[PDB]
RNA sequence: CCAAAACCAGCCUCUACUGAGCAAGAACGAGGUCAUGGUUUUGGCGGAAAUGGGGUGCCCCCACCCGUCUUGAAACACGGACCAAG
RNA sequence: AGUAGCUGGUUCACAUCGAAGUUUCCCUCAGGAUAGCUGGUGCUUGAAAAAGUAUUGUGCGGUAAAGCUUUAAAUGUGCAACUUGCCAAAGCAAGGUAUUAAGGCACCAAGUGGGCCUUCUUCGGUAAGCGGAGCAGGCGAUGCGGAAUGAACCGCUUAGGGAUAUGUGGCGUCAAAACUUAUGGGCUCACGAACAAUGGAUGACGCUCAAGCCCAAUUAGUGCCCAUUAUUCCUUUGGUAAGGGCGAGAAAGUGUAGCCCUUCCGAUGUAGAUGUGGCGUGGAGGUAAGGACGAAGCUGAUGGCGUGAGCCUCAGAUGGACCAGCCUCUAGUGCAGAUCU
């Protein structure tokens, strides 16, 4: 009886995950075509388009845990950047932009592409479950973690940690911070800022490349 | 080698320039019910009941009002603990806090980017 | 390669097995370990952990203090509701100061010969955790209680006496030895 | 397939005839071995624990179980594919004749039959 | 020698424990006495009406 | 190699406010490795010139600029730079290259060697293509003549990597490695 | 027992926009691999073989005498020839 | 057996955590006591009184700069999110109907109380590898990888291993890698490559269209190498972690040869604390067993087992008569070091 009701649910969930990610695919294709029209409108209008600011950065701890000061050392813990190539998505509040500004030599970050978000959540994605670090494998796994009619798909997660979400904290917090491998082909200098020809600090959209070699 | 009660207060208890003088009537007519937040900003013109020094500028709640004095509970970090101090204070040395004025305003009220059509636009070169 | 700062400090120290050599505690832990795991009841989870405690931390209760806490509990019970079983994970001791007590239904590890006789003189049952499990497998209207431990004379010694806030009891074979003039003494009271 | 096949020998047992090869944890701030410089001898630790379902298993594939007399053999009658009796060193060649023609009749293995 | 080195580290090991909550050791005692004494007169009357209230609830509960 | 420095034009403004309701937009040509540095150098000039800062502004366009073509030509790069040894040398060197980006990056390597000057000490001040004659500098003037022929003298011709060899027979090109 | 090949799984590697470029997205195809999992197959070896251990030598590589007090020991600081019993 | 705040020594393993060289006091300054740091034991309950972090709001400040002893930073810092007095009186007063994260409390107790270096800030000193402080980080107590070498520099911090990928550093040989790569730019002829006297030191050689310097690069106008690091895999151990289960096995279990399986996180470590169906010794109460077909002891390219202390077996062409196991009890109980006897 329950044995099959587990089927009615597992079938109903992909019916939902299908329905969800069909919307998210449309909500991407549409949102970006709309964001192309405007910047394209404006070029016709001899006119600039102030693109909406990033509302999510994929912060990545990039120096190791030795010799770090008590203020940086706390901010990294609150970012949950406790190891080297840990990663988290943190949305760019002023209060966060002032946390990130406090530990930039310890982190590389930028504004993840939707693809960067997919790869981390699908490949490197791990839910916290009963404190266990649990590899994402089922959408069943996700709906149980997130008791939230909003958050069912792994596509629900990627939208939250990309669109900026109303559950961006509800989602990203239920994820273990990402444990990325060191960037293939290496860094540049974990000591200099990115614009110095180094590695640390905000590197805008370029983080997707750097973070792609890692994932 | 010489830490008496007012060591190193040459600047701390100084009156501001052209702002010397004993506290006015607005001071004297302020009133402190217990549990009020306050600022123990010591005023040099009044010497009786002056706060130590650590307590200068500290905020705390009144726990006590005597006729000329406001008892104030002010946390002090002693070591691994914040001991919770009870300075006694003449009311001149206590400026009532606005530390919660925002939050009281809240429960008072509880009761992207687009095309920029701008046309002036100088070149930025040196 | 991990910040661990503040992780070890959050480690808790709990008993996970009884130090008691007593066989019956172990058959009794055998029960409620099971019963605590196999039932959803929070009562079995309390009887099971308390049962794992030190005899220090399993303080005895006065039958006087059960009769008080029980009638105080039962007096409000709507008519036709029989009173809760008075479970304690500890000994139950007779109290001379309360000669007559209500037909209590106490349940405890151990009873004084005085408590057991007064308990049955009132007609109350003096049942063990064995049939507690058989009558209330779940903590269904059990009234789990603890004996006192603040009045324990060991804790009268906690802290210093000489420290101004304190009313710790100094350690002394000689009561008159550390007696002192009223003038010389620590201030009694002091705000925290 | 064992982690380490070598003994964890005491440091500098090789120079001092009196020292047994048996392990003592090094002490002294300046001990090269407890400061665990890379060219030095290793110290035992939990990480060299053998795999736990192959543990205690002799290359015969049996766990040895001590045996002293013919009655012990029946302690291995029903688990004769798991335990192998190793007859104690001090049972007589007399008694071992008896353990052995009986450890044969029962299909129980013996390490030193 | 008087270096204060390793002290804030040694102090933040068990954190700076934050100060006790206002609802705890809220003894008056050395409070301006005349208020303090009138407070006793009220608190004692709160007790007689608290007990008198529970006596009411039981008599009400005999129904 | 392709030029060291891409040609960005970063456009941006101090973000609108009741203080400045309709702020000036600022175009700013940069020669940067990549836009994140071009965006950076752009905010460097915004505070060093307009007193507006990165927190308070907003780049409106990071886009790279298309090359004029590919014909060999002639660039007057105007390059201020800094050192402890020299605190601000204005200096219009000319370079011969196929692109503004190439002339400029060429001006950084030139400037980094004759002056131990890092990228962020330097700031380009403009990169006009120049006609043949305007180049006062005598070095690139040698290359103007429509009839210029020169030898590729004393070449080191390394083999294509696939064909390189450690040992070879002496009057042969039999490999022996 | 040693090998080798295969299969499956795993795993890994190897358009869009823009004005030719990107800050840009997948696909097809193929490879690698058991110090990955499961599926055998096929050969080689079989008084000896085989795996493991042990011993001795070498090779390449790594490697400052220990105990000690000390901020700091390889110290040109102290104690230290061997072993047994204590 | 005088006493010694001093010197020297203080004997098994493993696992779990792990300091301090500072506060006050002391005829105290080579020592105590005290508090902090640490361990153990809990207790209590589970975003309680969470925060070496911001934001926002509200205080505080008088250092740098300025200025000619005054305005004023940044880094900081606090805080917040009916009955009974007064009044003239019944109204006032008082008590009553962003991110992250398990919080707090108690008890007992150790070591420690010579620190050192460095960062930045300073003070003293002509200067110092100098005395003194502030801040933080380190070494101490810690390797590993790198800087040829180095306690504290750099990177990274550490269970036993493999793949992958890196970090600092490199890629002519030494030396892994540019089999001396670039289809890159300049510069350079004589030296050149982070922190006066034994002959000789870019580490050595050597290099010179560099194997040097500045710059940029990555196969080219169409990269590679090396970590105790990361990731992943296997195994171990710990978790007072999360679950499921109850041909041979299926034990209701802290701990063993773990009841079984599953998943997750952790693992360094001096002083020190603690654990251990942890090791081992002489003896005792028990149990069980062994021995003249050879006990103990001793010998051992005797293997086997255990992370280990160790146990076991084999063989003695050793011995000659005692004795291992297991649970409980006990102690004159474990030795390379005492200028030890
Ligand atoms: Mg590098
Ligand atoms: Mg650094
Ligand atoms: Mg002042
Ligand atoms: Mg009492
Ligand atoms: Mg001292
Ligand atoms: Mg010395
Ligand atoms: Mg540790
Ligand atoms: Mg000494
Ligand atoms: Mg001044
Ligand atoms: Mg000045
Ligand atoms: Mg090195
Ligand atoms: Mg080589
Ligand atoms: Mg350890
Ligand atoms: Mg004896
Ligand atoms: Mg030998
Ligand atoms: Mg002895």
UniProtKB/TrEMBL annotation, chain A:
The keyword Nucleotide-binding does not apply. Residues 1-52 form the Large ribosomal subunit protein uL30 N-terminal eukaryotes domain. One of its GO terms (biological process) is maturation of LSU-rRNA from tricistronic rRNA transcript (SSU-rRNA, 5.8S rRNA, LSU-rRNA). GO terms for cellular component: cytosolic large ribosomal subunit. Residues 58-107 form the Large ribosomal subunit protein uL30-like ferredoxin-like fold domain. The keyword Aminoacyl-tRNA synthetase does not apply. It comes from the Eukaryota. Keywords: Ribonucleoprotein, Ribosomal protein. Transmembrane segments: none annotated. One of its GO terms (molecular function) is structural constituent of ribosome. Signal peptide: none annotated. Coiled coil: none annotated. SUPFAM superfamilies: Ribosomal protein L30p/L7e. Belongs to the universal ribosomal protein uL30 family. This is 60S ribosomal protein L7, putative. It comes from Trypanosoma cruzi (strain CL Brener). The lineage of its organism: Eukaryota, Discoba, Euglenozoa, Kinetoplastea, Metakinetoplastina.
TrEMBL record, chain B:
PROSITE patterns: RIBOSOMAL_L21E (PS01171). Signal peptide: none annotated. GO terms for biological process: translation. GO terms for molecular function: structural constituent of ribosome. Keywords: Metal-binding, Ribonucleoprotein, Ribosomal protein. Pfam families: Ribosomal_L21e. Mg(2+) binds at residue 11. GO terms for cellular component: ribonucleoprotein complex; ribosome. Belongs to the eukaryotic ribosomal protein eL21 family. This is Ribosomal protein L21E (60S), putative. It comes from Trypanosoma cruzi (strain CL Brener). The lineage of its organism: Eukaryota, Discoba, Euglenozoa, Kinetoplastea, Metakinetoplastina.
Automatic annotation (TrEMBL), chain D:
One of its GO terms (molecular function) is structural constituent of ribosome. Keywords: Ribonucleoprotein, Ribosomal protein. Residues 24-53 are annotated as: Disordered. One of its GO terms (biological process) is translation. It comes from the Eukaryota. Transmembrane segments: none annotated. One of its GO terms (cellular component) is cytosolic large ribosomal subunit. The keyword Ribosomal protein applies. Belongs to the eukaryotic ribosomal protein eL32 family. This is 60S ribosomal protein L32, putative. It comes from Trypanosoma cruzi (strain CL Brener). The lineage of its organism: Eukaryota, Discoba, Euglenozoa, Kinetoplastea, Metakinetoplastina.
UniProtKB/TrEMBL annotation, chain E:
GO terms for molecular function: structural constituent of ribosome. One of its GO terms (biological process) is cytoplasmic translation. Residues 1-16 are annotated as: Disordered. It comes from the Eukaryota. InterPro entries: Ribosomal_eL29 (IPR002673). Keywords: Ribonucleoprotein, Ribosomal protein. The keyword Membrane does not apply. GO terms for cellular component: cytosolic large ribosomal subunit. Belongs to the eukaryotic ribosomal protein eL29 family. This is 60S ribosomal protein L29. It comes from Trypanosoma cruzi (strain CL Brener).
């Amino acid at each position: 009886k329950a044995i099959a009701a587990n089927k009615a649910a597992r079938v109903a969930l992909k019916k939902a995950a299908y329905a969800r990610g069909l919307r998210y695919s449309r909500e991407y294709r549409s949102a970006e075509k709309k964001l192309v029209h405007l910047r394209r409108q404006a070029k016709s209008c001899g006119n600039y388009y102030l693109e909406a600011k990033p509302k999510v950065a994929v912060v990545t701890r990039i120096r190791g845990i030795a010799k770090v000061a008590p203020k940086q050392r706390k901010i990294l813990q609150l970012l949950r950047l406790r190891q080297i190539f840990n990663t988290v998505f943190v949305r760019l509040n002023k209060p966060m932009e002032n946390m990130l500004r406090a530990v930039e030599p310890y982190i590389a970050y930028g504004y993840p592409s939707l693809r960067t978000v997919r790869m981390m959540v699908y490949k490197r994605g791990h839910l916290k479950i009963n404190g266990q670090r649990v590899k994402i494998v089922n959408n069943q796994m996700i709906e149980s973690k997130y008791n939230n009619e909003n958050i069912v798909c792994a596509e629900d997660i990627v939208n939250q940690i990309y669109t900026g979400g109303k559950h961006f904290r509800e989602v990203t917090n239920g994820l273990w911070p990402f444990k990325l491998s060191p960037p293939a082909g290496g860094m540049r200098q974990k000591r200099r800022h990115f614009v110095e020809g180094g590695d640390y600090g905000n590197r805008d959209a370029l983080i997707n490349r750097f973070l792609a070699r890692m994932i | 080698h010489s830490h008496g009660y007012k060591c190193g207060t040459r600047h701390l208890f100084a009156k501001k320039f052209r702002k010397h003088g004993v506290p006015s009537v607005s001071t004297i007519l302020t009133n402190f019910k217990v549990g009020d937040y306050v600022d123990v900003v010591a005023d040099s013109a009044v010497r009786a009941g002056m706060p130590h020094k650590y307590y200068h500028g500290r905020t705390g709640i009144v726990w006590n009002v005597t006729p000329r004095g406001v008892g104030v509970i002010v946390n002090k970090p002693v070591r691994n603990r914040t001991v919770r101090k009870r300075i006694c204070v003449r009311f001149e040395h206590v400026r009532k806090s606005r530390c919660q004025e925002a939050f009281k305003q809240k429960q008072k009220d509880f009761l992207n980017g687009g095309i920029v059509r701008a046309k002036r636009v100088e070149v930025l070169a040196r | 390669g991990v910040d661990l700062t503040g992780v070890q400090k959050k480690k808790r120290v709990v008993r996970h097995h009884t130090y008691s050599t007593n066989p019956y505690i172990k058959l009794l832990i055998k029960l409620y370990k099971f019963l605590a795991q196999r039932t959803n009841s929070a009562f079995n989870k309390l009887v099971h952990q308390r049962l794992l405690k030190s005899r220090s931390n399993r303080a005895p209760i006065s039958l006087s203090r059960i009769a008080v806490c029980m009638k105080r509990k039962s007096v409000w019970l709507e008519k036709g509701k029989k009173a809760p079983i008075a479970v304690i994970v500890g000994d139950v001791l007779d109290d001379v100061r309360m000669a007559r007590i209500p037909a209590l239904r106490v349940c405890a590890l151990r009873f004084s010969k005085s408590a057991r006789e007064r308990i049955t003189g009132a007609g109350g049952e003096c049942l063990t955790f064995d049939q507690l499990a058989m009558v209330a497998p779940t903590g269904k209207n059990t009234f789990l209680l603890r004996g006192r431990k603040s009045g324990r004379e060991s804790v009268k010694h906690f802290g210093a006496a000489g420290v101004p806030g304190s009313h710790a009891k100094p350690f002394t074979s000689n009561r008159g030895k550390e007696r002192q003039r009223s003038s010389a003494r620590r201030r009694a009271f002091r705000h925290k | 397939v064992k982690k380490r096949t070598k003994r964890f020998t005491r440091h500098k047992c090789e120079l001092f005839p009196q020292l047994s090869s048996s392990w003592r944890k090094p002490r002294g701030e300046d001990s090269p071995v407890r400061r665990r410089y890379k060219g030095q001898k290793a110290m035992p630790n939990k990480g060299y624990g053998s795999d736990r379902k192959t543990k205690y298993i002799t290359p015969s594939g049996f766990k040895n179980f001590p045996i002293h007399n013919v009655q012990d053999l029946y302690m291995l009658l029903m688990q004769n594919r798991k335990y192998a009796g190793v007859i104690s060193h001090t049972v007589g060649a007399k008694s071992r004749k008896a353990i052995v023609r009986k450890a044969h009749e029962l299909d129980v293995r013996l390490i030193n039959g | 020698n008087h270096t204060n080195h390793n002290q804030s580290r040694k102090n933040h090991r068990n954190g700076i424990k934050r100060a006790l909550p206002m609802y705890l050791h809220n003894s008056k005692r050395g409070s301006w006495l005349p208020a303090l004494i009138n407070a006793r007169r009220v608190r004692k009357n709160n007790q007689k009406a608290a007990v008198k209230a529970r006596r009411e609830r039981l008599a009400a509960h005999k129904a | 190699v392709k030029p060291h420095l891409r040609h960005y034009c970063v456009v941006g403004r101090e973000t609108p406010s009741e203080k400045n309701p309709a702020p000036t937009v600022y175009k700013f040509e940069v020669f940067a490795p990549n836009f994140v540095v071009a965006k950076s150098r752009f905010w460097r000039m915004m505070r060093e010139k307009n007193k507006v800062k990165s927190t308070h502004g907003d780049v409106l366009s990071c886009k790279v600029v298309k090359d004029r073509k590919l014909a060999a030509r002639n660039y007057s790069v105007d390059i201020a730079y800094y050192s402890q040894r020299c605190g601000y040398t204005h200096m219009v060197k000319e370079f011969r290259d196929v692109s503004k980006a190439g002339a400029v990056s060429q001006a950084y390597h030139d400037l980094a060697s004759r002056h131990r000057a890092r990228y962020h000490n330097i700031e380009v001040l403009g990169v006009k293509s120049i006609p043949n004659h305007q180049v006062k500098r005598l070095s690139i003037s040698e290359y103007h003549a429509s009839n210029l022929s020169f030898p590729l003298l004393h070449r080191r011709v390394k083999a294509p990597r696939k064909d390189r060899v450690v040992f070879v027979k002496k009057n042969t090109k039999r490999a022996v490695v």
